[PDB]
Amino acid sequence: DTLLTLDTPAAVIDLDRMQRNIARMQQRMDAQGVRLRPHVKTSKSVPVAAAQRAAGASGITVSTLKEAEQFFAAGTTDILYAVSMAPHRLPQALQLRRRGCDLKLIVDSVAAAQAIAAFGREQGEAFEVWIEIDTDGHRSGVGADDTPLLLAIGRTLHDGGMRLGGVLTHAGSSYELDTPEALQALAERERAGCVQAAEALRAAGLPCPVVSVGSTPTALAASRLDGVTEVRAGVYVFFDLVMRNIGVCAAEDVALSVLATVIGHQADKGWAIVDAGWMAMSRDRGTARQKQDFGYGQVCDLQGRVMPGFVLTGANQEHGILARADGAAEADIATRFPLGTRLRILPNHACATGAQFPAYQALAADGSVQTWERLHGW
Amino acid sequence: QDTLLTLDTPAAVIDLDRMQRNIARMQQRMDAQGVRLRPHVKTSKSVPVAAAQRAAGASGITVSTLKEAEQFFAAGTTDILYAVSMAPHRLPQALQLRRRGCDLKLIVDSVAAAQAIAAFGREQGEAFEVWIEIDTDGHRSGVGADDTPLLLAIGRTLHDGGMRLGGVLTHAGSSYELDTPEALQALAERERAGCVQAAEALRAAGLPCPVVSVGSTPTALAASRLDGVTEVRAGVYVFFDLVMRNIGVCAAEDVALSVLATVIGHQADKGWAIVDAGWMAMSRDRGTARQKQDFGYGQVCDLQGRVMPGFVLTGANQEHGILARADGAAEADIATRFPLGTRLRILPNHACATGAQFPAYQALAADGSVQTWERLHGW
Ligand SMILES: *Cc1c(COP(=O)(O)O)cnc(C)c1O
Numbered sequence A: 001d002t003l004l005t006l007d008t009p010a011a012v013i014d015l016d017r018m019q020r021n022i023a024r025m026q027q028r029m030d031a032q033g034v035r036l037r038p039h040v041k042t043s044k045s046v047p048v049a050a051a052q053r054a055a056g057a058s059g060i061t062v063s064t065l066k067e068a069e070q071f072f073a074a075g076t077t078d079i080l081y082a083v084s085m086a087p088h089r090l091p092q093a094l095q096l097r098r099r100g101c102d103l104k105l106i107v108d109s110v111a112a113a114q115a116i117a118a119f120g121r122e123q124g125e126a127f128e129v130w131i132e133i134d135t136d137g138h139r140s141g142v143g144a145d146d147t148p149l150l151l152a153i154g155r156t157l158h159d160g161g162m163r164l165g166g167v168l169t170h171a172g173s174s175y176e177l178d179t180p181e182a183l184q185a186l187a188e189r190e191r192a193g194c195v196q197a198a199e200a201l202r203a204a205g206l207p208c209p210v211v212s213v214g215s216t217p218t219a220l221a222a223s224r225l226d227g228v229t230e231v232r233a234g235v236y237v238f239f240d241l242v243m244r245n246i247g248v249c250a251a252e253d254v255a256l257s258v259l260a261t262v263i264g265h266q267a268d269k270g271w272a273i274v275d276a277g278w279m280a281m282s283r284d285r286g287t288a289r290q291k292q293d294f295g296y297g298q299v300c301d302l303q304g305r306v307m308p309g310f311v312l313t314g315a316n317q318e319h320g321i322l323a324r325a326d327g328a329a330e331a332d333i334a335t336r337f338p339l340g341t342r343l344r345i346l347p348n349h350a351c352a353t354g355a356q357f358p359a360y361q362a363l364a365a366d367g368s369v370q371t372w373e374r375l376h377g378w
Numbered sequence B: 001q002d003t004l005l006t007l008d009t010p011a012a013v014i015d016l017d018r019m020q021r022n023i024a025r026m027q028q029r030m031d032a033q034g035v036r037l038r039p040h041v042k043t044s045k046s047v048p049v050a051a052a053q054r055a056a057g058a059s060g061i062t063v064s065t066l067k068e069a070e071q072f073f074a075a076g077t078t079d080i081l082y083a084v085s086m087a088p089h090r091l092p093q094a095l096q097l098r099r100r101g102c103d104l105k106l107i108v109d110s111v112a113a114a115q116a117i118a119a120f121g122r123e124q125g126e127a128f129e130v131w132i133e134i135d136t137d138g139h140r141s142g143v144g145a146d147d148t149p150l151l152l153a154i155g156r157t158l159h160d161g162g163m164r165l166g167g168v169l170t171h172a173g174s175s176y177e178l179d180t181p182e183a184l185q186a187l188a189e190r191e192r193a194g195c196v197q198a199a200e201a202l203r204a205a206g207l208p209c210p211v212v213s214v215g216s217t218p219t220a221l222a223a224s225r226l227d228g229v230t231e232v233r234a235g236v237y238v239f240f241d242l243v244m245r246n247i248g249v250c251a252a253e254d255v256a257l258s259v260l261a262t263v264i265g266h267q268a269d270k271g272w273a274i275v276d277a278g279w280m281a282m283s284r285d286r287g288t289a290r291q292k293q294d295f296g297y298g299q300v301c302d303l304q305g306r307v308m309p310g311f312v313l314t315g316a317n318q319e320h321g322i323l324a325r326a327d328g329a330a331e332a333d334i335a336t337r338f339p340l341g342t343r344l345r346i347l348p349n350h351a352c353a354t355g356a357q358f359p360a361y362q363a364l365a366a367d368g369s370v371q372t373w374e375r376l377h378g379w
C-alpha cells in the first residue's frame, strides 16, 4: 500500500516531517526546563501520541472525556481534561479515576468547584482540580489579577478536601498574531499571568505545585518560562497553514496533507476538479483572515513539493476547485493535471481537517503506508 | 429511556415530527410535478432517515461517495446514483457493487472519463450505466448545456463503447447565493432548461437519453414547471438549516436538526455564556455570514427547542462555544439568564456540515424519548 494505491481523499501523515516537528517541540521545552504535555485533540490517535511520548512527552491533555477513555484504555494514565468541568460529567470522571486513570479536571467558577468538592466528599474522592486562568481575554478562566475569585475557588477546593493541583492558562489569542515580537510578548503575558496566580495561591497558603501554560505559537515563541512547570501544545505535531502564516513554521514543515485525485476540469476557467471537497478539508477558512489566504488549501504534488500559486479556491461537499490564487485562468489546465493525477492539499487547520477522517495514512521513508485510526465524536 | 435530559452533550438531535413534515412536503411537491424524487443521502448518511424518505414515496437514492453506496446497498437499496464524476481508479469498486446486484449509476463530464469507463467495461464484460453531468450555473463540474460537440462526443464514446448512456443530470448549487422567491424560480427554470436542452441534443443526434435529473433543495421547492425532467434530486431538505432559512425555503421552525449543549461557564462582564458545543460539534461552517442574517455558529434555542431570539454562538473554539447577543451588546446577568448546567439546542448553519461531526444522531420522538441513529463517516 502506497500513495498510488490509496483511495482518495485520504489524510496522509508524512512521518519524517512529523518526527522533525515532535523533536523541535521537545528540544525547545527541554531548553526551557519544562515538561511538555501534548494536546491530543489535534490527532486523537494512539500511535501519534505514542510518538510524542517516545521523544519525551509527559502525559497528555484531552478535550473530552471520550478522549480520556480512549487514551486510558490504550495505556495513558496521566490525563489532563482541559475544558471547564460540567457537573453532569462528574460520575464519568469518578469512574475513570476509580479505574486508575489519574484524571485531572479544571474549573473557573466557585459553583463548579462547589459541585466537584461536594460530589468528591459524598463519593470519598479527592479529585485533583486545577484553576483555569484567563491571561488574554480569549475564552474561560479567572482574570489573572482577580485574586478574590482566584482565592475563593482555591479555598472551595482545598477546604473541601479535594486536591488543588495547580493553575493553567491557554493563550488562544496567539492565533491572531503574525510577528515574532507580538508572539513573544503574548507568551510573556501568558507566563506572567499564570505565575502571578500561582504565587497569590501560595501567599494565601494554598498549594499550587503545577503551573501549566501554552498554545503552539506561545510554546515556540516564549523567550523565558520561569515559574512554569509544563507547556501544553497540540497542533505543532502536524502544523498547518494557519501556523505557517503565524510565522512558527514553513509550509514544508506541514506533516499532514490530503491526498486527492483530479476527477475533471473546467478548462474555460482554468479549474481542475479534485475529489477533496469541504468534507475532506473541513469548512475551516482560518487563513482568510490572515495575510495570505489559501482558500481550502495549498496544493502540492504527489511527492509533497509545494506548488505556490495553486490553491483550492472553491470547495463543495465532495469536489474541490483547484485554480490559480492570482485568479487568472490557467491555460491548458487539463494537460497540466490530466484526469487521474494525484495531488496533496495542505490544510488551513490540522485539527479541523484531521477530524474529517476515520484514520490517517502514515507514510514511511520507503513510500509504504500504515493506517492509523483516530477518534470521532463524544 | 434516554431523554434530552440524560443524553450527553454535545449531541446531534433530530426532531422526528419536524423531519416528517419536511419529508411529506418535498415528496408532495414532486408528485404534483409528476416527477420521481431521488433523495440525496449525503445530508444524513443514515439508513433510517432514508427508510423514512423511501417510506414517503421516494425512488432510489443519490450518494456522494461509493462508501455511501456500499452502506445503502448492504441495507437493501439497489437503485443508486453515485453523483460525483467518476474517477477511473474507482472502477473496480463500482464494478464489484454492480456484480453483487447494485444497480449503480456513474456520471462523467469528459471524453477521457467516458473512454476509461468504456475500456474497463469492455475488458470486464460490464455495460456500466453512465449519465452525463451538465453545467447549467457555472459553480462546478459539467458539460455546458449548449456544448453540443462535447455532449455528442461523450455520448458516442459511451454508446459506441458498449456502455449504457442512461441520462443527463445537473445540480444548480448557486441557490445559496440567492434569497428571493423570484431569483430561486428563475434559477430553477435555468437548471431545468439547460438539462432538458442537453437531453434533447443527445436525442436529436440519435443517442438514448431517457433520464433527465435535476435538483437542489431550494430549486426543487421553487420550480413552477418541470417539463422534460424525469427525476428531482434533493437532500438538505430532510432537516433544513439556517442557510436554507436565510435563502427563504423554510422558517427556523422547520429545522429538525439541533445540537444539544450544556452551559459550562461564563464571562460575566462580557455577557458570555460558555457551552460545550464548539466548532467540533457545529462544524466550521459559516454559510450565514454572507446572508441577510448572520447566526455565527448557530441560533440558540431552549431545551424544548424554541428559538430564543437575539442569542447566538458568536464564536467557537474546538470544544467551547461562545453564546452572546447577536446585536453585539453585553447581556446583564448572562449567568442568571443561562445558569451553569442548563442545556440548550443550537440550530446549525449547514445541516450537511453539522451532522458529519457526529458518529450518530439522536432521533427524538413524540414522547421525549430518543433513539441512536448511526450515520456514516469517511470514505
Ligand atoms: C488546543 C489547546 C492547547 C494546545 O493548543 P495548540 O495551539 O492547538 O497547540 C493547550 N491547552 C488547551 C486548554 C487547548 O485547548
Ligand SMILES: *Cc1c(COP(=O)(O)O)cnc(C)c1O
Residues within 6 Å of the ligand: B040, B042, B062, B064, B083, B170, B171, B215, B216, B217, B218, B233, B234, B235, B236, B237
Ligand atoms: C448535494 C447534492 C444534491 C442535493 O442538494 P441540496 O441542496 O443539498 O439538497 C443534488 N445533487 C447533487 C449532485 C448534490 O451533490
